[model samples]
Target: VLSEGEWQLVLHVWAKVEADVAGHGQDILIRLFKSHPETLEKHDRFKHLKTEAEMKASEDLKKAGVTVLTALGAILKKKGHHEAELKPLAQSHATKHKIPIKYLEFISEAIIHVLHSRHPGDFGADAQGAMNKALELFRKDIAAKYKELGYQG
Candidate 1:
């Protein structure tokens, strides 16, 4: 489970992803946490490791997660790959977890909300595109996984 501060990190990344990728928003996110190490201290996880390496690794994971927003936007625009990317993702998850397509949209919205809170201006435009991509690609990803598992979507 993510603590409040950890969730802020998620929201901060979401905000950047929703706003603009060309501006290297992900880097801004990294800078934010690096600048305010207090956030990590507030969270319980960082207290245990007590090492720069551990913190750096955790920060890297956050950076990677933030990229998902950009990738989602790129996918939606068909920037460098297939257009229907998210649909399969959603399908596979739905099948595996015995969930439904509706859940994907719900989760996607929460992600968007986080982005909006983090980068209010950027998220305004980019979020729409990013979310559309997420909905489409995640659904596709889910479907493909289901197919591999011998389940038809």
Candidate 2:
């Protein structure tokens, strides 16, 4: 039983991750900027990134994402969601990204890097694996949830 703050964090992280997955795949935007510096001009987070004036400001969004994931796990567990829910989410994300399975693999790897880097201390092996599991579960859960609501993917 998590407290309200924990539940909120879980929900928030899950939502953020889900949005990123749908929009561009988690951390893909950031990776693009890093790998192709020219892409920075097209980034949505460019303006929000720090101007080297502050160390902490640069990680604001990344931190927010971590907080969300940590709490989201607790919330999902309480809500009766389990590991079985991952497949649909992965499928939806793959469709949303318009990428083949290989590209999705790349995206998942990138997301893992983002989460682990964002919270080095908190995203150790167990937590990171759990996060991956949660993501897989969400993929399946989204499909189930949508199906229940008369939506098809």
Candidate 3:
């Protein structure tokens, strides 16, 4: 649960770069693949993107990044409302893509890092912590769905 002030901080910071949400999202994806190569192996679409420059050049990756950021934007707008939006995709990732629940932590950390990097002036420790908490809550819901589907992850 983000505090009112924290929510405002997130919204304010996001507003600054929302016009290019895909760019920020792709940046985080690149960071994740760079920092944790194993995570990229799970995605057929992105697995071939060996270099940061290569990933950045992928239109498919750009579109996927936009989709993810759009979902995140919904979460920022209405908090838990986006759970319904995310739940089906989470289940599908587990059942079809075999994406482990653990990968969410990596993605969340990358997102937090990118958020702070993008808005160093607006995102302080409190804001960063709020973003962490928010992504954890989101990840937990996905993990629950993953478990329900008999995925050990």
lDDT of 3 by residue, 1-153 (tens): 668877777777778659798899799888888989998887787688877789989998888888778877787776655667777877778888887867878888888888888888878887777677677778887788778778877
Against the reference, the lDDT scores of all candidates come to 0.48, 0.47, 0.80
Quality of model 1 by C-alpha lDDT: 0.48
TM-scores, all models, native as reference = 0.36, 0.37, 0.89
**Deviation (Å) of 105 in candidate 3:** 0.4
Q: Of models 1 and 3, which has the larger lDDT?
A: 3
Which scores higher on lDDT, 2 or 3? 3
- Model 2, 7-51: lDDT tens digits are 444444555455443222325445533544443443355334533
Which window of 10 residues has the lowest lDDT sum in candidate 1? Answer: 1-10
Q: Best by TM-score, which number?
A: 3
Q: What is the C-alpha lDDT profile of model 1 across 78-122, one tens digit per residue?
A: 432443565554453445445444444444555555556666665
lDDT score at residue 62, model 2, on the 0-100 scale? 53
Alpha-carbon deviation at 152 in model 3, angstroms: 2.8
> Model 1: C-alpha RMSD to truth?
11.6
